[PDB]
């Protein structure tokens, strides 16, 4: 019983130095890359073997043509924004679109854009409206909100199409996306400075990457130091939490994929 997601990203770069695509688009299911396209290859290709084995050549050929179309649209969209801001030189434009399928069967969908890695326009598929961050974003917001048919297209795509694609992709990649590898969880005692003891709860070998780790007394602890959930580079993740003891004064709690662990 866990959440899955499908996401398509788009990166456009104006005046890229010779070694940088003007345009990249990558799809993800959860943390896995499923699809790639850029302005150098001009080809949509699978980044997961379970996508490769399950979608016939016509899929890649069709979406190749679609991605050439969207690459051109992106380039014109960026140029226009740069006109609006009166920006010269290299700038970035980004878009993320996707949906979540939760356990209860409920869904979410989103679409947002970024100029130089900052929030520009965020879509509301319920009020069918665009949140603009500045005056320039408001100007694009008015053009987009005047095309009622496009807002409705977008609502439908996020709520029906995106979820249909996700379910199809989840079935293709079920052995990867729906498996569990439980964490190997150790507790280290380190003297960090003389007299002063700190406890490190470390976890590795786990998938999915989502995991909860905390320290409790006999009541949660204050000043817990958290390590990022990091990829081990074999399809599994590592992560840790530390506490520092008080002079003359504890257990590590981990929760992963519906399994709860205590180390005292």
């Amino acid at each position: 019983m866990r959440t899955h997601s499908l996401r398509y990203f788009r990166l456009g770069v104006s005046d890229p130095i010779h070694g940088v695509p003007e345009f990249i688009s990558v799809g993800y299911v959860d943390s896995h890359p499923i699809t790639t396209y850029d302005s150098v290859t001009r080809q949509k290709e699978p980044r997961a073997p379970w996508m490769a084995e399950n979608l016939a050549p016509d899929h890649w050929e069709r979406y190749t043509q679609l991605l050439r179309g969207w690459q051109q649209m992106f380039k014109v969209e960026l140029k226009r924004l740069q006109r609006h801001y009166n920006h010269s030189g290299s700038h970035t434009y980004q878009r993320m679109i996707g949906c979540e399928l939760l356990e209860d069967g409920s869904t979410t969908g989103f679409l947002q854009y970024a100029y130089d890695g900052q929030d520009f326009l965020i879509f509301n598929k319920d009020t069918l409206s665009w949140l603009a961050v500045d005056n320039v974003a408001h100007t694009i917001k008015q053009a987009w909100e005047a095309n009622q048919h496009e807002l409705l297209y977008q609502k439908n795509w996020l709520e029906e199409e995106c979820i249909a694609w996700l379910k199809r992709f989840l079935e293709y990649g079920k052995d990867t996306l729906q498996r569990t590898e439980p964490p190997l969880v150790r507790v280290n005692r380190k003297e960090t400075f003389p007299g002063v003891t700190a406890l490190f709860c470390k976890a590795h070998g786990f998938y999915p990457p989502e995991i909860y780790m905390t320290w409790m007394k006999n009541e949660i602890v204050q000043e817990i130091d958290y390590g990022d959930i990091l990829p081990s580079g074999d399809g599994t993740y590592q992560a840790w939490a530390s506490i520092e003891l008080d002079p003359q004064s504890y257990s590590c709690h981990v929760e992963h994929s519906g399994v709860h662990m205590v180390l005292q």
Partner: antibody
Amino acid sequence: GQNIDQPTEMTATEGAIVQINCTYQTSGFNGLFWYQQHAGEAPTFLSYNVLDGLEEKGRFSSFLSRSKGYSYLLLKELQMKDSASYLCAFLDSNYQLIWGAGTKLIIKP
Amino acid sequence: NAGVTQTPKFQVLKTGQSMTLQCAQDMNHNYMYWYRQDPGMGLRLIYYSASEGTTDKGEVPNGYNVSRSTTEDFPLRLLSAAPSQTSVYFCASSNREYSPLHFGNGTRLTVTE
């Protein structure tokens, strides 16, 4: 991206009402369109539905039932100038535009 | 704007001749399409182009080729006129893959042996 059906021909009287039905079967859907094509002329965009319900522009309405896989184009207060082919088309999951064989509308004065 | 300009309106060919149908739009549209309309069936896609620099086969591409070296123009070439190619041809454009098509005024084409 499977199938789309609309009647070959309908006949109605000037001043009356006509409902042109279009049924479609698909797994995946990005909207259904009606175009108007006069004898010897280009098809011209009339309507776009993607959500359930009814859209109204003067004498023309377009309905869509997603669970029925069904749309109609409703013409009220028919004029001789409404004598034309009405083309049903929808977009599948890959934006393939799937075209009906079209409905020839004959108006009787 | 003019919309979609398609020429010629009419053409007779002998079996084996080649022919180019011209089509231009001044609407900065990314998508251009070639369709044939034959009695008793839906518009059939011959070729389309998602943008300048790319083209792809429709449902009935055999006997035809296209090019899209500009946003504006999408010429259709009949390689070797056959009677089966007697039809009405329509050039169309759309801003995007899901936006409404704007149609040219069509080319009525008859091939005779």
